[PDB]
Amino acid sequence: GPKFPRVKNWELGSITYDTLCAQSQQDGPCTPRRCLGSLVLPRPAEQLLSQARDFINQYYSSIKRSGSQAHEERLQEVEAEVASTGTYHLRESELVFGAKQAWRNAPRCVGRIQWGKLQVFDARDCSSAQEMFTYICNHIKYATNRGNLRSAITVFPQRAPGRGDFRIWNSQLVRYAGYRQQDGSVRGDPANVEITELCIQHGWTPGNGRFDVLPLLLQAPDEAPELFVLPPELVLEVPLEHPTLEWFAALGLRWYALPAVSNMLLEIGGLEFSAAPFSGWYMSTEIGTRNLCDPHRYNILEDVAVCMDLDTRTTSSLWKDKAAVEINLAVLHSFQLAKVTIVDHHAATVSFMKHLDNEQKARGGCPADWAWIVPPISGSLTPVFHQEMVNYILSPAFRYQPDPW
Amino acid sequence: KFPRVKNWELGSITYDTLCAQSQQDGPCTPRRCLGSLVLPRKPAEQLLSQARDFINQYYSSIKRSGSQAHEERLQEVEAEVASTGTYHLRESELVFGAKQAWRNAPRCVGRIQWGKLQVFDARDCSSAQEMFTYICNHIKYATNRGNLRSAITVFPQRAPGRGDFRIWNSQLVRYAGYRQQDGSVRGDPANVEITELCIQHGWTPGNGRFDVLPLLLQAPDEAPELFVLPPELVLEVPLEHPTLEWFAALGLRWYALPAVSNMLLEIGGLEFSAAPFSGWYMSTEIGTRNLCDPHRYNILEDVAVCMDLDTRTTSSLWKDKAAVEINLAVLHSFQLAKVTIVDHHAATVSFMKHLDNEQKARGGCPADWAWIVPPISGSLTPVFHQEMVNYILSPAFRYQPDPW
Ligand code: HEM
Ligand code: HEM
Ligand SMILES: Cc1cc(N)nc(CCc2cncc([C@H](CN)Cc3cc(C)cc(N)n3)c2)c1
Ligand SMILES: Cc1cc(N)nc(CCc2cncc([C@H](CN)Cc3cc(C)cc(N)n3)c2)c1
Ligand SMILES: C[C@H](O)[C@H](O)[C@H]1CNc2nc(N)[nH]c(=O)c2N1
Ligand SMILES: C[C@H](O)[C@H](O)[C@H]1CNc2nc(N)[nH]c(=O)c2N1
Ligand SMILES: [Zn+2]
Numbered sequence: 001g002p003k004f005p006r007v008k009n010w011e012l013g014s015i016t017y018d019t020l021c022a023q024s025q026q027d028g029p030c031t032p033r034r035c036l037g038s039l040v041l042p043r044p045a046e047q048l049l050s051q052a053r054d055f056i057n058q059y060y061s062s063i064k065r066s067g068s069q070a071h072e073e074r075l076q077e078v079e080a081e082v083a084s085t086g087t088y089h090l091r092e093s094e095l096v097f098g099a100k101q102a103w104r105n106a107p108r109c110v111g112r113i114q115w116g117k118l119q120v121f122d123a124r125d126c127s128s129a130q131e132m133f134t135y136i137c138n139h140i141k142y143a144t145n146r147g148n149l150r151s152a153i154t155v156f157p158q159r160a161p162g163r164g165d166f167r168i169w170n171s172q173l174v175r176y177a178g179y180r181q182q183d184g185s186v187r188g189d190p191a192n193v194e195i196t197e198l199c200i201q202h203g204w205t206p207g208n209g210r211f212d213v214l215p216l217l218l219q220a221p222d223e224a225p226e227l228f229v230l231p232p233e234l235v236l237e238v239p240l241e242h243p244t245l246e247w248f249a250a251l252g253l254r255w256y257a258l259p260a261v262s263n264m265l266l267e268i269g270g271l272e273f274s275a276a277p278f279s280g281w282y283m284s285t286e287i288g289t290r291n292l293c294d295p296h297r298y299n300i301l302e303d304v305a306v307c308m309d310l311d312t313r314t315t316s317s318l319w320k321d322k323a324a325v326e327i328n329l330a331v332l333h334s335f336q337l338a339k340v341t342i343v344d345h346h347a348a349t350v351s352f353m354k355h356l357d358n359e360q361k362a363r364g365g366c367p368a369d370w371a372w373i374v375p376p377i378s379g380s381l382t383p384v385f386h387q388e389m390v391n392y393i394l395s396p397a398f399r400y401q402p403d404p405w
Numbered sequence: 406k407f408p409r410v411k412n413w414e415l416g417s418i419t420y421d422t423l424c425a426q427s428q429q430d431g432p433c434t435p436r437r438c439l440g441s442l443v444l445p446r447k448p449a450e451q452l453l454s455q456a457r458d459f460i461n462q463y464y465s466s467i468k469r470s471g472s473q474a475h476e477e478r479l480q481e482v483e484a485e486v487a488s489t490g491t492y493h494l495r496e497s498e499l500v501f502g503a504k505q506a507w508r509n510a511p512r513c514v515g516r517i518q519w520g521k522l523q524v525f526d527a528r529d530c531s532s533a534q535e536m537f538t539y540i541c542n543h544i545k546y547a548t549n550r551g552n553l554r555s556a557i558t559v560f561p562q563r564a565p566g567r568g569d570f571r572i573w574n575s576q577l578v579r580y581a582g583y584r585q586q587d588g589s590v591r592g593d594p595a596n597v598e599i600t601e602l603c604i605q606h607g608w609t610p611g612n613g614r615f616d617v618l619p620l621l622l623q624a625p626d627e628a629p630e631l632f633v634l635p636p637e638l639v640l641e642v643p644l645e646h647p648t649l650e651w652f653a654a655l656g657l658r659w660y661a662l663p664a665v666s667n668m669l670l671e672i673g674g675l676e677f678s679a680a681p682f683s684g685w686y687m688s689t690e691i692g693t694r695n696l697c698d699p700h701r702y703n704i705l706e707d708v709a710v711c712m713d714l715d716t717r718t719t720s721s722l723w724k725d726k727a728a729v730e731i732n733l734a735v736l737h738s739f740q741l742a743k744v745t746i747v748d749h750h751a752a753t754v755s756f757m758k759h760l761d762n763e764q765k766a767r768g769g770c771p772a773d774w775a776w777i778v779p780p781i782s783g784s785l786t787p788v789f790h791q792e793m794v795n796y797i798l799s800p801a802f803r804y805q806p807d808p809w
Contacts, residue, residue, distance in 0.1 A: 005432075005437060005439055005442075005446065006446060007442075008442075008443070010443060010700075011698070011699055011700050012700075018437075021436060021437045024436050024437065027435035027436060028435060028436075028437070028438055029408075029435075029438075030433030030434065030435065030437075030438045030439075030440070031433065031434070031435060032430035032431060032433065032434065033424060033427050033430065033431070033796060034408065034421075034424045034427065034431065034433075034794050034795060034796040035431055035432075035433045035438065035439075035440040035773075035794070035795040035796065036408055036438075036794060037433070037438040037440040037441075037774070037795075038440075038774035038792050038793045038794075038795075039408070039409075039410075039411070039792050040411070040413060040792070043409075289784055289785075290784060293784070293785065294414070294784065294790075295414055296413075296414050296415075296790075301785070315748050315750035315751045315754075316736045316740070316748045316750075316751070317733075318729055318732060318733050318736070318748070320750065320782060320785045321729045321732070321781065321782045321785065322729055324782060324785055325722060325725050325726055325729060328722060328725070329721075329722050332720045332722070336720070344719050344720045344722070346719035346720075346724065347719045347720070350719075370440075370441035370775055371774055371775065371778075374775075374783070375783075376783045376784030376785075376789065377725060377781065377782055377783065377784065377785070378724065378725045378728065378781050378782075379778075379779075379780045379781065379783050380693055380694060380697070380698065380780030380781065381693075381697065381705070381724045381725065381728055381780075381781070385780065386698075386700075388441045388442050388443065389441045390437050390438070390439060390441075391437065391438040391441075392436060392437040392438070
């Protein structure tokens with residue numbers, strides 16, 4: 001066949017070839033000798049100018065003016081700006097396009113069918129930590145929209161030569177505190193023990209619940225971060241109940257509505273936006289399987305299995321599997337009752353298959369990371385399991401960045 | 406460079422140095438990762454060096470690396486390749502090699518058992534009839550009345566001047582799939598092609614959902630011949646549920662013995678095109694894949710209705726609930742009939758232990774994450790949380806093209 005990777009769907013027997021991977025200008029971690037696709041973390045001047053040119057060409061294609069006079073004029077304006085200042089600046093519509101494309105490009109995101117619908121708040125005028133806070137409250141307010149969630153991103157000023165970064169220290173806008181106890185265990189979310197402890201060193205008076213919303217630690221250029229408490233009325237939470245296990249509500253479990261990543265770098269045309277929090281809505285297995293049942297997270301599987309009267313002393317009862325189903329169901333059910341947008345792992349993966357087909361036609365492929373795309377329960381019950389995927393990095397992109405401290 | 410391999414549940418890190426022993430490229434490049442692909446897209450000096458390298462692996466395993474015997478063995482090998490273009494393995498080397506192929510298999514979650522493998526040397530086989538007798542003794546041995554024992558039977562190697570010994574079936578025990586005029590399949594839609602081949606070679610077909618197939622066995626450069634397994638050799642387990650008593654009414658069943666029969670065994674550059682091997686099942690293979698895959702027996706809907714679940718919306722998690730009950734039925738029924746099986750939690754725990762043994766023994770363990778992590782309750786098992794490095798070491802089991 002073609003000299004492009006052949007991709008097969010083993011449920012349907014259908015074949016495609018990914019031609020888009022040819023556009024990748026950045027190597028991932030694999031080599032002919034070994035595959036490293038399961039690793040979580042893979043570890044300017046004329047360099048900028050070629051990233052910028054490439055990006056401006058993408059922009060002009062997306063509005064179909066490629067080769068036009070407005071296109072060659074924009075390229076010239078960008079070289080000139082880099083020429084004299086070493087950096088350059090995006091037009092507003094370039095930023096909107098770049099941010100949507102970074103989402104569209106993200107191999108780990110199963111929600112990409114929605115990529116074209118993304119409210120881009122331009123916060124490139126922001127000049128203080130206080131002002132980042134206001135922009136973030138606004139974002140949370142718009143995005144949350146009383147339960148009818150809307151995707152969004154807010155972009156703060158880009159990295160600039162010499163000057164310090166804008167950084168949000170929290171990994172998400174909304175996270176629960178984790179408090180290291182004297183018996184070595186953790187109350188709350190163990191994932192957040194470090195950020196929690198940083199909040200405290202920085203003047204936060206800590207709570208002591210399992211579900212305490214963390215304040216934000218916001219760093220403007222060349223300043224220590226400042227601490228901001230989110231007004232509780234802005235942070236929508238959903239108390240968890242089960243549709244028929246009546247005791248489940250008695251567990252006092254809850255989760256917040258808005259998944260908002262706050263510590264990733266949005267890179268567009270070689271410009272680096274170090275603070276650019278984005279949010280969507282949840283797929284239910286993020287909450288009910290990973291956050292509530294990971295052994296190194298809330299770890300509630302046993303407690304639930306015991307309430308369900310399961311045989312927890314033997315693996316072959318499938319007690320873990322049965323409890324996790326019920327916690328997942330409780331998540332879906334409680335979000336539905338509260339009218340807060342959520343999608344189950346069946347409907348999300350069916351939509352992601354549709355995304356693959358849309359992108360096969362529009363661009364000749366879709367970068368996707370199978371291990372992250374297949375949900376953490378019921379994998380082979382979803383269509384994505386049976387679907388081969390090609391993973392590669394395209395730009396614009398969201399990239400992990402090291403913690404600021 | 407050596408990859409750092411992190412476990413995200415426990416925070417522990419290793420470094421894989423075994424991968425430097427890989428002599429053999431996989432599908433991935435720095436521009437794109439292809440590790441979710443099921444199949445690979447794709448002279449005497451070269452045989453001789455895979456030969457010496459394998460002979461070195463063997464003497465080193467028995468702690469005699471430098472002995473008379475080692476050096477005299479390397480010379481035999483050299484003397485035979487120089488003269489004939491090929492060579493032969495000693496029975497002890499074949500045994501070492503087969504065990505090592507299994508150890509090295511990145512898709513196998515049962516490798517904690519790698520040292521316990523009964524190897525039948527069938528390289529003195531000259532006819533499809535003889536292949537059949539060897540296969541029957543393998544099934545009898547491996548089945549052992551439900552107390553299953555891992556086994557491999559090794560038929561004669563490929564030779565330059567001639568066709569391969571092959572078993573056309575993909576497993577020694579498979580259920581027929583009969584296509585109907587109106588597109589539907591009766592039985593296992595994975596086995597329609599092999600079913601029709603058996604019929605075209607003179608098999609009188611059954612018409613059930615669970616008809617055990619005959620073997621099409623091929624000696625070199627002859628048409629394959631058909632052999633019906635005696636039903637008493639093929640142990641089967643009726644499926645029932647410990648609490649839902651209508652589940653038995655579904656009339657479901659599965660065979661005890663997973664025995665792969667279409668893969669090529671490569672040892673020291675020699676290739677054994679027929680070398681069927683078996684162990685015992687992990688319950689998710691039957692309960693989740695074979696019974697619930699939409700392109701397999703696809704019974705999820707039926708089960709969900711018998712459970713009275715709401716089928717018209719994904720968000721009732723009716724599929725998840727039914728799959729769990731089916732998996733539980735398999736484990737319960739294998740346990741009841743006293744036939745070895747292992748659940749996905751116990752199996753993945755044993756694999757973690759295997760990773761650790763191999764880290765000490767060899768500096769690494771090649772593993773294919775997408776195949777190791779089970780197809781339900783992924784993150785509920787420890788292997789979800791374990792980074793894994795995938796690469797090809799030899800001795801190896803390899804995929805090969807269907808012979809027809
Ligand atoms: C609209 C609803 C959305 C859904 C249901 C969704 C779903 C998901 C899920 C399930 C993951 C994997 C999460 C994990 O295991 O940690 C994820 C990852 C991600 N998604 Fe989305 N997504 C949505 C919107 C967004 C938006 C609006 C953006 C960016 C504009 C985005 C970018 C990402 C990125 C960058 C990752 C990777 C995160 C990382 O590596 O830590 N997605 N998505
Ligand atoms: C003793 C119990 C054993 C268990 C529980 C077991 C478990 C498994 C499982 C679950 C798979 C994935 C199968 C699939 O999804 O189709 C597998 C693959 C495999 N195992 Fe095992 N294994 C066992 C013994 C063996 C033995 C004895 C050999 C060889 C001597 C072997 C070689 C393989 C190979 C080559 C594969 C890859 C097969 C393929 O590509 O289709 N395993 N193992
Ligand atoms: C916009 C959006 C929507 C949605 N439904 N889910 C999300 C999930 C975001 C998220 C939440 N909790 C943890 C993660 C990741 C791990 N699963 C965080 C992470 C950690 C590390 C070490 C690397 C990495 N790339 N990402 C990501 C984002
Ligand atoms: C020795 C052993 C033990 C055990 N528990 N399970 C097995 C399962 C073997 C098996 C059964 N049925 C299908 C398969 C594979 C796909 N899941 C067959 C296969 C197909 C293809 C196209 C490629 C490939 N590498 N392998 C493998 C073997
Ligand atoms: C080791 C492994 O890569 C890691 O546990 C991955 C597996 N798949 C995942 N998939 C998603 N969506 N999110 C994750 O955090 C992970 N974790
Ligand atoms: C496309 C994907 O690689 C394919 O569905 C794989 C996924 N993981 C698997 N895992 C095992 N153990 N067996 C399988 O057949 C598969 N199939
Ligand atoms: Zn790879």
